[PDB]
Amino acid sequence: GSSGSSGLDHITVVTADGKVALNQIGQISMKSPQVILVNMASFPECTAAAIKAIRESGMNLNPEVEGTLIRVPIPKVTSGPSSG
């Protein structure tokens, strides 16, 4: 959870009957140089939810999930064919 780092801390996760930021149901903590960790020890039941948001965040990313620590690997520079 840092200023201008990864569009997740702002992302929202759909909960039971409510909405919240990814930096609410879990704690964002950058582990690797391109992997965002999200501890859901506070919401191990809303783990999937988070993962969803990510996927449902106009981001064709593949979020991981380990026990209660979600992993979000960062892609490489230049996304597919870009030139317009």
From Swiss-Prot:
<comment type="similarity">
    <text>Belongs to the RRF family.</text>
</comment>
<protein>
    <recommendedName>
        <fullName>Ribosome-recycling factor, mitochondrial</fullName>
    </recommendedName>
</protein>
<comment type="function">
    <text>Responsible for the disassembly of ribosomes from messenger RNA at the termination of mitochondrial protein biosynthesis. Acts in collaboration with GFM2. Promotes mitochondrial ribosome recycling by dissolution of intersubunit contacts.</text>
</comment>
